[PDB]
Amino acid sequence: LAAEQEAQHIVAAARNAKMARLRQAKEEAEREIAEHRAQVER
């Protein structure tokens, strides 16, 4: 049924949520470090 495929897509998106949070955390650490570096360099 289409319900099973839509539920599989929902599960995939739910996993992608956890993946994307962790992926964006590392990049955001760079932004935080850049703000700290600007504050220091001033």
Binding site: A2, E6, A7, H9, A20
Partner: protein, 47 residues
Amino acid sequence: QMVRFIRQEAEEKANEISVSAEEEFNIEKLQLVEAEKKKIRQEYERK
């Protein structure tokens, strides 16, 4: 009928989960900026 409605509901749930993925990425992006001011204050001018 019921199967199609359940499929539509699960598709809406998938869309909500993808929106939550984007929201969590942006949330990490903001949270790294969040609470950095206190660390800079205790690290830079306190020093």
